[PDB]
A paper describes a structure:
The core region of the U6 snRNP retains the unique “interlocked rings” topology of Prp24 and U6 snRNA and is virtually identical to previously determined structures of U6/Prp24 binary complexes, with a comparative r.m.s.d of ~1.3 Å. There are protein–protein contacts in the U6 snRNP that were not visible in previous structures, including a 660 Å2 contact between RRM4 of Prp24 and Lsm2, and a contact between the conserved C-terminus (or “SNFFL box”) of Prp24 and Lsm5 and Lsm7. The architecture of the free U6 snRNP provides insights into how spliceosomal RNAs can be remodeled in the absence of an ATP-dependent helicase.
In order to elucidate the basis for this selectivity, we generated U6 snRNPs with 3′ terminal phosphate groups. Inside the ring, RNA is bound in a shifted register relative to that observed previously. In this new “Up” (or uridine phosphate) pocket, Lsm2 residue K20 forms a cation–pi interaction with the terminal uracil and a buried salt bridge with Lsm3 residues D71 and R69, the latter of which participates in a cation–pi interaction with the penultimate uracil. The remaining contacts with the terminal uridylate are dominated by electrostatic interactions with Lsm3-R21 and Lsm8-K87, K90 and K92.
Residue numbers in the entry:
A (entry chain D): 2 to 44, 69 to 84
B (entry chain A): 30 to 398
C (entry chain E): 7 to 85
D (entry chain B): 1 to 95
E (entry chain G): 26 to 71, 85 to 105
F (entry chain C): 1 to 79
G (entry chain F): 10 to 84
H (entry chain H): 2 to 44, 47 to 64, 87 to 108
RNA sequence: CAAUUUGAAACAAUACAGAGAUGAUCAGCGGUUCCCCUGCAUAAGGGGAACCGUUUUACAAAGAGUUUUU
C-alpha cells in the first residue's frame, strides 16, 4: 500500500525530510518503484534511498 | 502419426557396427557430420570390447541416406557396417520404480545384449510414468531380450518387454477413467453406501461394469461418503451426470466425471505454489534443480538411503518441473527446517542439489535463465 | 554519454573523487560495468573542504589499484 | 539460505536478542523471514528493564538489520549439523 | 524514466551527492542510469573547487534541480 | 578452499578472533557463517573497549552460543 | 573483466587493502572473490598509512568483508 | 515468514534507527518495511496524521549506528597495552 | 467476492507406449514485450523468456479484512 498510496496520490502537497535533515515541501508529479520523487513548488528529483520519511496531507 | 514419427525414427537413425576401439562420440561425429546435421550420437563398446557400435540420429532423412553410403568403408583398419536401425527397439515397462538408465543397461549386460540407447519419459505432465525404449544392436538381440525378460520377476515387479510398436499398445487397467466412463458420486450418507442400492439407482443410465467403494467409510461413521461407478460406455456415464444435485434417499448427491491422478496432483501443486498460508507450507521443503526425468520414488530412495530419513517422516512428494524442482512434505515444521539444512548441497545422481523454500526454488530458476 | 567519455579516458590521467573527502589521481587503466576502476601509479589524497592548499597527500601508490565503484562520486578526466 | 533454516529450527525457543542500539530483549521466537527479521512473542527485557518504552509490548517484530547478537544456549544446537551445513553452503558461497 | 533530463540538457543544474558533497554545473549529457556529463563543474564540500569537465556516477546522486 | 569464505570454512571448529564495529572483539569456536559473514560462535567471549576520559576500559561478556550479524563484522582471524 | 583479470594477476602478490573506515591491511593476498572479500597472509593493520601506528600484526590469514573494501593495490 | 499482518490498524510502538520512538497505527506496509502509519506522535505530541516512514529507518515494531571517534586510536592503545 | 480450515472419504493392480507427455495439468483465441540463432549492422526466417484481454470452476459448513549485511 505505501508505493501505490504515493503513485495514486499523484498531486498532493507533501513534506519530505531527507536523511541529511534537509527538509523539502512541494507538490508531487511522479513516483518510481524505488520511490523516487519528482516534485515542484519547492523549498526537484529526489532519489528514494535519500528519504527519511514523508509527512502527508489529506486523510 | 503413430506410423509417421515411427517411420521418421526408423528413417533417420543409423547403426554403425565395427568402429575402432579408439573411436568415441567425437570421432564418430567428425566422421559422419559431413553426411548432414546430426542430432545425436551414442557410442557403446561391443560385448567383448573388441570394437564399438554407434547410434547416430540425423536431423533429416538426407543424413541417414548419406550415412549409409559409408557402409563397408574402412575406419582405421575396421570394415564398418552402416544400416538403418529397424526392428531393433524394445519397449519395457513395469521395471522397479527405482530402476535407472544404468540399472536397465545392467539388465541387458546380464543377458549379454549391448544397449545403444535407453530413453525414458518426461514426468512433466504425469509423475507416475514408467517405461523405456531401448535400442539394441540387432533384431535377433531384441527378440532375445523379449524371450529372457518378458515376464521376469525383478525386485517384486514382473517386467513387461515387447518389441516396440505403439500400434499394439494394451488398454491400461485404469482405462475407464481415461475414457470418461467412471463417475464419482459424492456426499452419500453411510446408509446409502451400498453397492446394490447404487446399481439399482444408476443402472437405468446404462450397463454398469464396476462399483468401487473406498474402504473405511462406514466403519468410521463418516458424515459424507463417496463412491465410484464405472459404466460400460461413455454415453452412460454422461447421462448419469443427471443425478448431480438430485436426491438419492435423503441426501443430495453430487456426480461428476472422475478426475485422473495427474490432474489432481497438479492442481494440488498449483494450490501449494500459490499458497500464502503457513501451517502447510512450513512443513515442506523444495529440492532443485532436478531433471524432469526423476520420479518421486527415486527421490524417496535418495532420502532414505543417503540421508537416512525414515519412510514415515515423509508425508508426500510432488514434482514441480516448471521450476526444475520437487516438493517434499514432512510431518512438522521443525523436522522440515532441519531437513532443509541437512539436504542443502547434498549429492543426488552425482550432482549437487540445493534445498530451500518454494521462493528459493523459484529464484534459483529465474536466476539461471 | 558518460560511459563513452570514461572509455575515451583509458590510458589518460583521471581524477576519481569519492563520496568522502578523498580522491585518487592516476592513469586510468580500465573499468567494469559496476564502474570499478583500475588505476595506475595512483596518488591518494585526503581533501580539506576549506583550503585546497592544506590538503593531505595520504600515499603515493605504485603499480595498479582496484578502486571499488561503490564510493566513486565524480570522474574528472585529466586530473 | 542457512541462518534462516537455523532460526526456523529454533522457533518456539526462548532467546535473547541484543540490538545494534544495545537494547537486549528476552523473548520467544515466533517467526523468521529471508531477511532474518524476527517476531518475538511475550518479550521481556534483561537486567535493565528500565526502558518503559518496552516490556509492556506483547510481541515485537525486529528488523533483521537492527540486530547485533542473538544469544542462545548450547542445548539448543547440533553443532555437527551446523558445521556440516556451513561446509555444504560454503561450496555454494559465491552467492 | 521518471525525471526527463533532456529539458535540462543545456542549462545549469544543481546535484546533491550521497556523502554530503554539493555540485553545481551545466548539464551536457546523461544516460538512462542518470550518469551525467557536466561541464564547468564546481564542487562544494561540507569551500569550492573548480573541476571543469566531469562525469558523475548516477548511483550516488541524491537530488537534482535547476541551478 | 578457494574463495576467502571457503578458506574460512577451513577454520570451522577452531578458535577464531573477530573485530567488530564499536571497538569490540570476540573470540570463540566457529560453528557457522554465510556470505554476509553472519556467524555463529560457541563458547564466545566478547570484549568491549571503552574510553573513560583518559581511556582504557575493557569489559567482558561470555556466552554459550551466539549469533553475530555479519554487517557488524569488520575482520576475522585466529587468536 | 579487466578488473577480474587484475584480481587474477595479484593473487599471491603483496598488497595494500584499504577499507571504507580507512583501516589499511598489508600482506600477501591469499584469496579474493568477485565480491572483493579478501584473505591475507602475514597481514599488518595500520590506520591510513603503513607509516602510522601499528594496530595489529596477524600470524594467520585475515579475512576482510568485500562490502567494506575500498581499494586493493599492489604494494 | 515474519510479516506485519497481525499489527495492521492497531496502535504500535516504533523504534527508529536513530533511536527515536513513534506511537502510531499502521494501515499498510511493504516488503521493505515502509511504514504507512496514521496518528503518529513521539513516545509526546502528534507529529502528523498520515505519514510514510521509510523502512531503512525502522529498527523495531542510542541509534543502530556505532560510529565512534575513529576507533583507530583505541586500537593502537589496545595494541600497545598488549605489548 | 476471495483466502483459509473443514464435512472428506480419490477408489479402482503400481507399471501399462519417447518433448510421440497435458484437462487453462503447463490451454485456445486476440494482442504486447524481451532474449538468442542464422543473416548484409539488410531484409526475411526461426527457437527460448515473461505479460495483458478473454474463454473455465460438484456441494455444503465455518470463517474471514536504490532501504535488510552500517
Ligand atoms: K524412473
Ligand atoms: K491466456
Ligand atoms: Mg480430507
Ligand atoms: Mg535487424
Ligand atoms: Mn491406485
Amino acid at each position: 500500500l505505501p508505493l501505490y498510496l504515493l503513485t495514486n496520490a499523484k498531486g498532493q502537497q507533501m513534506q519530505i525530510e531527507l536523511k541529511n535533515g534537509e527538509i523539502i515541501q512541494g507538490i508531487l508529479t511522479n513516483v518510481d518503484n524505488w520511490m523516487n520523487l519528482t516534485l515542484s513548488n519547492v523549498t526537484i528529483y529526489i532519489r528514494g534511498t535519500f528519504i527519511k520519511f514523508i509527512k502527508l496531507q489529506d486523510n | 502419426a503413430n506410423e509417421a514419427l515411427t517411420r521418421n525414427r526408423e528413417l533417420t537413425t543409423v547403426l554403425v557396427k565395427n568402429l575402432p576401439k579408439s573411436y568415441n562420440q567425437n570421432k564418430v561425429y567428425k566422421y559422419f557430420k559431413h553426411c548432414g546435421p546430426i542430432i545425436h550420437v551414442d557410442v557403446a563398446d561391443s560385448l567383448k570390447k573388441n570394437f564399438r557400435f554407434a547410434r547416430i540420429e540425423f536431423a533429416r532423412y538426407d543424413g541417414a541416406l548419406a550415412a549409409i553410403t559409408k557402409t563397408h568403408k574402412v575406419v582405421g583398419q575396421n570394415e564398418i557396417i552402416v544400416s538403418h536401425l529397424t526392428e531393433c527397439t524394445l519397449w519395457m515397462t513395469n521395471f522397479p520404480p527405482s530402476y535407472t538408465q544404468r540399472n536397465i543397461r545392467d539388465l541387458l549386460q546380464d543377458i549379454n545384449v549391448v544397449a545403444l540407447s535407453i530413453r525414458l519419459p518426461s514426468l512433466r505432465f504425469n509423475t507416475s510414468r514408467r517405461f523405456a525404449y531401448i535400442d539394441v544392436t540387432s533384431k535377433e538381440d531384441a527378440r532375445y531380450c523379449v524371450e529372457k525378460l518378458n515376464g521376469l520377476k525383478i525386485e517384486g515387479y514382473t517386467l513387461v518387454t515387447k518389441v516396440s510398436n505403439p500400434l499394439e499398445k494394451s488398454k491400461r487397467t485404469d482405462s475407464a477413467t481415461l475414457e470418461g466412463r467412471e463417475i464419482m458420486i459424492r456426499n452419500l450418507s453411510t446408509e446409502l453406501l451400498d453397492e446394490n442400492l447404487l446399481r439399482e439407482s444408476f443402472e437405468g443410465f446404462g450397463s454398469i461394469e464396476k462399483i468401487n467403494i473406498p474402504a473405511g467409510q462406514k466403519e468410521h461413521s463418516f458424515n459424507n461418503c463417496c463412491a465410484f461407478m464405472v459404466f460400460e460406455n461413455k454415453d452412460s456415464a454422461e447421462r448419469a451426470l443427471q443425478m448431480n444435485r438430485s436426491l438419492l434417499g435423503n441426501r443430495e448427491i453430487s456426480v461428476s466425471l472422475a478426475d485422473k491422478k495427474p490432474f489432481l496432483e497438479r492442481n494440488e501443486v498449483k494450490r501449494l505454489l500459490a499458497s500464502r498460508n503457513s501451517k502447510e507450507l512450513e512443513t515442506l521443503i523444495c529440492l532443485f534443480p532436478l531433471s524432469d526425468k526423476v520420479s518421486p520414488s527415486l527421490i524417496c530412495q535418495f532420502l532414505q538411503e543417503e540421508i537416512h530419513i525414515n519412510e514415515k517422516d515423509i508425508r508426500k512428494i510432488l514434482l514441480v518441473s516448471d521450476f526444475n524442482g520437487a516438493i517434499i512434505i514432512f510431518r512438522d515444521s521443525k523436522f522440515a527446517a532441519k531437513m532443509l539444512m541437512i539436504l542443502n548441497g547434498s549429492q543426488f545422481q552425482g550432482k549437487v542439489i540445493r534445498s530451500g523454500t518454494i521462493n528459493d526454488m523459484k529464484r534459483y530458476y529465474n536466476n539461471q535463465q | 554519454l558518460p560511459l563513452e567519455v570514461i572509455d575515451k579516458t583509458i590510458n589518460q590521467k583521471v581524477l576519481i573523487v569519492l563520496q568522502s573527502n578523498r580522491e585518487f589521481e592516476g592513469t586510468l587503466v580500465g573499468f567494469d560495468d559496476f564502474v570499478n576502476v583500475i588505476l595506475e601509479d595512483a596518488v591518494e589524497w585526503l581533501i580539506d573542504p576549506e583550503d585546497e592548499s592544506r590538503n593531505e597527500k595520504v600515499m603515493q601508490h605504485h603499480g595498479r589499484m582496484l578502486l571499488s565503484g561503490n564510493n566513486i562520486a565524480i570522474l574528472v578526466p585529466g586530473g | 539460505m542457512l541462518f534462516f533454516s537455523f532460526f526456523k529450527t529454533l522457533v518456539d525457543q526462548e532467546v535473547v536478542v541484543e540490538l545494534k542500539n544495545d537494547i537486549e530483549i528476552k523473548g520467544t521466537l515466533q517467526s523468521v523471514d529471508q531477511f532474518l527479521n524476527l517476531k518475538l512473542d511475550n518479550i521481556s527485557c534483561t537486567d535493565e528493564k528500565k526502558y518503559p518504552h518496552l516490556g509492556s509490548v506483547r510481541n515485537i517484530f525486529i528488523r533483521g538489520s537492527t540486530v547485533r547478537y542473538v544469544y542462545l544456549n548450547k542445548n539448543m544446537v547440533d553443532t555437527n549439523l551446523l558445521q556440516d551445513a556451513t561446509r555444504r553452503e560454503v561450496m555454494t558461497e559465491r552467492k | 524514466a521518471i525525471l526527463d533530463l533532456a529539458k535540462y540538457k543545456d542549462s545549469k543544474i544543481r546535484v546533491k551527492l550521497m556523502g554530503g558533497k554539493l555540485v553545481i554545473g551545466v548539464l551536457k549529457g546523461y544516460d538512462q542510469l542518470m550518469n551525467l556529463v557536466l561541464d564547468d563543474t564546481v564542487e562544494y564540500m561540507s569551500n569550492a573547487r573548480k573541476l571543469g569537465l566531469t562525469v558523475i556516477r548516477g548511483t550516488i546522486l541524491v537530488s537534482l534541480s535547476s541551478a | 578452499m578457494e574463495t576467502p569464505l571457503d578458506l574460512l570454512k577451513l577454520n570451522l571448529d577452531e578458535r577464531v578472533y573477530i573485530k567488530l564495529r564499536g571497538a569490540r572483539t570476540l573470540v570463540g569456536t566457529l560453528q557457522a557463517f554465510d556470505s554476509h559473514c553472519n556467524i555463529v560462535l560457541s563458547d564466545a567471549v566478547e570484549t568491549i573497549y571503552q574510553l573513560n576520559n583518559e581511556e582504557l576500559s575493557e569489559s567482558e561478556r561470555r556466552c554459550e552460543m551466539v549469533f553475530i550479524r555479519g554487517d557488524t563484522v569488520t575482520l576475522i582471524s585466529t587468536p | 573483466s579487466v578488473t577480474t583479470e587484475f584480481l587474477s594477476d595479484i593473487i599471491g602478490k603483496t598488497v595494500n587493502v584499504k577499507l571504507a573506515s580507512g583501516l589499511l591491511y598489508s600482506g600477501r593476498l591469499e584469496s579474493i572473490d568477485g565480491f572483493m572479500n579478501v584473505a591475507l597472509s602475514s597481514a599488518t593493520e595500520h590506520y591510513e598509512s603503513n607509516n602510522n601506528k601499528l594496530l595489529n600484526k596477524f600470524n594467520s590469514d585475515v579475512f576482510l568483508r568485500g562490502t567494506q573494501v575500498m581499494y586493493i593495490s599492489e604494494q | 515468514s515474519a510479516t506485519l499482518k497481525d499489527y495492521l490498524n492497531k496502535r504500535v510502538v516504533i523504534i527508529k534507527v536513530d533511536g527515536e520512538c513513534l506511537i502510531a497505527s499502521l494501515n499498510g506496509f511493504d516488503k521493505n518495511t515502509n511504514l504507512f502509519i496514521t496518528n503518529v506522535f513521539n513516545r509526546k505530541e502528534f507529529i502528523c496524521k498520515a505519514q510514510l516512514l521509510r523502512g531503512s529507518e525502522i529498527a523495531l515494531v542510542k541509534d543502530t549506528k556505532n560510529k565512534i571517534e575513529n576507533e583507530h586510536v583505541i586500537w593502537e592503545k589496545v595494541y600497545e597495552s598488549k605489548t
